[PDB]
């Protein structure tokens, strides 16, 4: 009626390592739980993992003299009845600082009615085509990563060049400004004597300096727009990666479900080795 066999239990998951249980309780609501065989592999241990307060609480079930329970008094006939007892009353009884009522079990039957083509050939055929999508899609992401990282280095290299240009410009322009400062007292005396060469030659250096100053600023000016194009192309690569990533998770998650599913229904993975 309620206390059916532990095998025919939605929450009981058998022998799944702790790592698998973590991926199945990750970012789930407070009160999620599932049961599995203790990690030691000894018979009749049945660790209970509960998700309370962001953390994965891990309460152990003791089995002595054909009885089960958390604390010393194992006043319970079987795991199913113990779970159902605490599935209706909060665990504050066992632990005063533990207030959750085993609300959302992680049922293994829910995963069952999401798959299709239960036969042995369609699974391999459908699974084979996902792998083609997975490898081609996965490699697609990896190639973009190379552009994203290679693009990042070029942007940083250009940015440092801009700083160097700024320093160079300030050095050049400051000298020009220093030109007049020093060319204030000698200029009057030079003007008095009608020496065309001194006026022209002084302007000759000054004229050359203006070309250098102007030429340098042009170099920085052009390089900046080159960076902006790189910066723009950089963001675009970021957009593609973000819109590709969830596809990889979705494809890989469904892809592995079938690969794991093939083993469950009495199929040896040697044949799946060549199916790919």
């Amino acid at each position: 009626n309620n206390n059916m066999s532990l095998q025919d239990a939605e929450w009981y998951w058998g022998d799944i390592s702790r790592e698998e249980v973590n991926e199945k309780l990750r970012d789930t609501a407070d009160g999620t739980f599932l049961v599995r065989d203790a990690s030691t592999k000894m018979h009749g241990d049945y660790t209970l993992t509960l998700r309370k307060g962001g953390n994965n609480k891990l309460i152990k079930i003791f089995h002595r003299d054909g009885k089960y329970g958390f604390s010393d008094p194992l006043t319970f006939s079987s795991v199913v009845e113990l779970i159902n007892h605490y599935r209706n009353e909060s665990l504050a009884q066992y632990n005063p600082k533990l207030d959750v009522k085993l609300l959302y079990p992680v049922s293994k039957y829910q995963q069952d009615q999401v798959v299709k083509e239960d036969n042995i050939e369609a699974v391999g055929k459908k699974l084979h085509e996902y792998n083609t999508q997975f490898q081609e899609k996965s490699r697609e992401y990896d190639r973009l990563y190379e552009e994203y990282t290679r693009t990042s280095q070029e942007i940083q290299m250009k940015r440092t060049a801009i700083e160097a240009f700024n320093e160079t410009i300030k050095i050049f322009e400051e000298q020009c400004q220093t030109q007049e400062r020093y060319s204030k007292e000698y200029i009057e005396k030079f003007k008095r004597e009608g020496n065309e060469k001194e006026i022209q030659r002084i302007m000759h250096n000054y004229d050359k300096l203006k070309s250098r100053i102007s030429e340098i600023i042009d170099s920085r000016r052009r390089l900046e727009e080159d960076l902006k194009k790189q910066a723009a192309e950089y963001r675009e690569i970021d957009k593609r990666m973000n819109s590709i990533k969830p596809d990889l998770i979705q494809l890989r998650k469904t892809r592995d479900q079938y690969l794991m599913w093939l083993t469950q229904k009495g199929v040896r993975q040697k044949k799946l080795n060549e199916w790919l």
């Binding site: 160097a164 160079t168 050095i171 020093y182 250096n205």
Partner: peptide
């Protein structure tokens, strides 16, 4: 060979500054 020579007066007393690739003086 250049216009003004009245300030230098010697070769010492100078540091010969420039700008490096790391963008620092």
């Amino acid at each position: 060979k250049y216009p003004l020579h009245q300030l230098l007066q010697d070769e010492s007393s100078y540091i010969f500054v420039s700008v490096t690739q790391e963008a620092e003086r």
